[PDB]
């Protein structure tokens, strides 16, 4: 506000609205998130500070945080396109495997970094993965479910995407672990490969059941303790696990192996970002430049 000239509304994110803006003084171009109010947390405003010092090449830089006039502004380094747009633009031919692999690899580095600093993203999706002309991809819009929790929607009547939500969140787990980010990234990896959302649920239960229909209804054997989770119902339909080869054709076996590990039901068996970086799938990783139309 006042020190910035809104150039264009980029989107209506989760907590607020996001604008492309220019610092009327420095002339620097940035992404400005405006947050939705008579209290304002402290554990939050300090969860923010931790994010400011959280600097990594695969994490969008948080430049400034401005709390004024019952509004909270987060100033981020600006990137030119999100992965959702890039995937749509590449739908006819598909993103070449080397670029998919590079993006996945960089995103795992970003996650390995935040997770080692005990920071969870919580809401990874194509729209919050930003890319630039140099072939980089960065994590954006980290969620503070440990600050603003997660109400009925985003901030003003808008359908929240559940497509990338880990099963343990859907089943009512109160405490998320870093594993929820691995699950979301696995769903994104699959989507880049097939050019179709892996689990496109339109409600929590439909989301949950689409996961069950593909990976099999979980039980105590593959997920110890699953039947005692908050929203688990013995009445859940029992679907058999589908052949994984039908899930992401024509991804090679290394890629399928890695994906299967990112999609393990048990949060404790799900591969970590660090371990995923060492998977054979990345033996030939490179950093190609994407063809971006801006
Ligand atoms: N989703 C989300 C929510 C809150 C903040 C941010 C964010 O920090 C952004 S958003 C952006 N630019 C951009 C994004 C999308 C497009 S698009 N649809 O491809 O044309 C173009 C530029 N840059 C940064 N840093 C991102």
Rg (CA), the chain: 19
How far apart are the CA of 32 and the centre of ligand 1, in A?
9
DSSP letters, 22-84, are EETTT--EEEEEEE------STTHHHHHHHHH---TTB--EEEEEEETTEEEEEEE--SEEHH
Catalytic residue among 123, 202, 206, 266: 123
DSSP label of 228: G
63-76 per-residue burial string, b: 16 or more CB within 10 A, e: under 16? bebeeeeeebbbbb
- Which CATH number covers residue 38? 3.30.200.20
Specify whether 3 is located in the same domain as 123: no
Give the residue from 28, 62, 80 where a domain finishes: 80
Specify whether 109 is located in the same domain as 201: yes
Specify whether 157 is located in the same domain as 247: yes
Q: Which residues contact 65 (CB under 8 A, 6 or more apart)?
A: 45, 48, 49, 52, 72, 73, 74, 75
Q: Scanning the structure block, which residue is given the tokens 């990112």?
A: 262
Q: Which residues sit opposite 66 in a β-bridge?
A: 73
Q: Which of 107, 141, 136, 132 is nearest to 17 (CA)?
A: 141
- Which CATH number covers residue 273? 1.10.510.10
Specify whether 75 is located in the same domain as 164: no
* Ligand 1 site, residue 257, Cβ cutoff 6 A: no
Specify whether 138 is located in the same domain as 251: yes
Specify whether 20 is located in the same domain as 57: yes
Report how many helices (DSSP H) and strands (DSSP E) the chain contains, helices first. Answer: 8, 8
Give the residue from 33, 50, 80 where a domain finishes: 80
Q: Where are the alpha helices (DSSP H) in the chain?
A: 45-53, 83-89, 97-116, 167-170, 179-194, 204-215, 253-262, 273-277
Q: How many domains are there within the chain?
A: 2
Our answer to whether residue 181 is catalytic in this structure is no
Q: Which residues sit opposite 19 in a β-bridge?
A: 9, 32
CB 119 within 8 A of CB 51: yes
84-117 per-residue burial string, b: 16 or more CB within 10 A, e: under 16? bbbbeebeeeebebebbbbbbbbbbbbbbbbbee
Nearest-angstrom CA–CA distance, 151 and 157:
11
Specify whether 21 is located in the same domain as 90: no
Specify whether 123 is located in the same domain as 42: no
**Cα 243 to the chain's mean position, in Å?**
26
* Deposited resolution, Å: 1.8
How far apart are the CA of 1 and the centre of ligand 1, in A?
18
**Could you tell me the residue range of the domain that residue 269 belongs to?**
81-291
Query: DSSP 3-state assignment of 87?
Result: helix
Nearest-angstrom CA–CA distance, 68 and 45:
13
Q: Experimentally, how was this structure solved?
A: X-ray
Query: DSSP 3-state assignment of 5?
Result: strand
Give the residue from 29, 49, 80 where a domain finishes: 80
The Cβ of residue 139 has, within 10 Å, a number of other Cβ atoms equal to: 25
Q: Is 59 exposed, middle or buried (0-12, 13-18, 19+ CB in 10 A)?
A: buried
272 conformational bin, left if phi > 0, alpha if psi -120 to 50, beta if neither: beta
Specify whether 108 is located in the same domain as 13: no
Specify whether 90 is located in the same domain as 106: yes
Q: Which residues sit opposite 23 in a β-bridge?
A: 4
Q: Which residues are annotated as a binding site for Mg(2+)?
A: 128, 141
Q: Which residues sit opposite 56 in a β-bridge?
A: none
Specify whether 114 is located in the same domain as 236: yes
Specify whether 47 is located in the same domain as 169: no
Nearest-angstrom CA–CA distance, 263 and 268:
11
Nearest-angstrom CA–CA distance, 31 and 18:
7
Q: Which of 221, 223, 217, 229 is nearest to 264 (CA)?
A: 223
């Amino acid at each position: 506000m006042e020190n910035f000239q809104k150039v264009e509304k980029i989107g209506e994110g989760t907590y607020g609205v996001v604008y492309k803006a220019r610092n009327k003084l420095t002339g620097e171009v940035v992404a400005l998130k405006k947050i939705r109010t008579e209290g304002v947390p402290s554990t939050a405003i300090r969860e923010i500070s931790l994010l400011k010092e959280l600097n990594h090449p695969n994490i969008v830089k948080l430049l400034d945080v401005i709390h004024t006039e019952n509004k909270l502004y987060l100033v981020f380094e600006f990137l030119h396109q999100d992965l959702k747009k890039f995937m749509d633009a590449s739908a006819l031919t598909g993103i070449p495997l080397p670029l998919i692999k590079s993006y996945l690899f960089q995103l795992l580095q970003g996650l390995a970094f935040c997770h080692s600093h005990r920071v969870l993203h919580r809401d990874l999706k194509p729209q919050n993965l930003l890319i630039n002309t140099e072939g980089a991809i960065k994590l954006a819009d980290f969620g503070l479910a440990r600050a603003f929790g997660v109400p009925v929607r985003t901030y003003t009547h808008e359908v929240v995407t559940l497509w990338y939500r880990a099963p343990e969140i859907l089943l009512g787990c109160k405490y998320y672990s870093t594993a929820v980010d691995i699950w979301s990234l696995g769903c994104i990896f699959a989507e880049m490969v097939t050019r179709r959302a892996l689990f496109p649920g339109d409600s929590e239960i439909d989301q949950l059941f689409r996961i069950f229909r593909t990976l099999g209804t979980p039980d105590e054997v593959v997920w110890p303790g699953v039947t005692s989770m908050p929203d688990y119902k013995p009445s859940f339909p029992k679907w058999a696990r589908q052949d994984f080869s039908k899930v992401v054709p024509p991804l090679d076996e290394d890629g399928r192996s890695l994906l299967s590990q990112m999609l393990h039901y048990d949060p404790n068996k799900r591969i970590s970002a660090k371990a995923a970086l060492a998977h054979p799938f990345f033996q030939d990783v490179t950093k190609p430049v994407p063809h971006l139309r801006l």
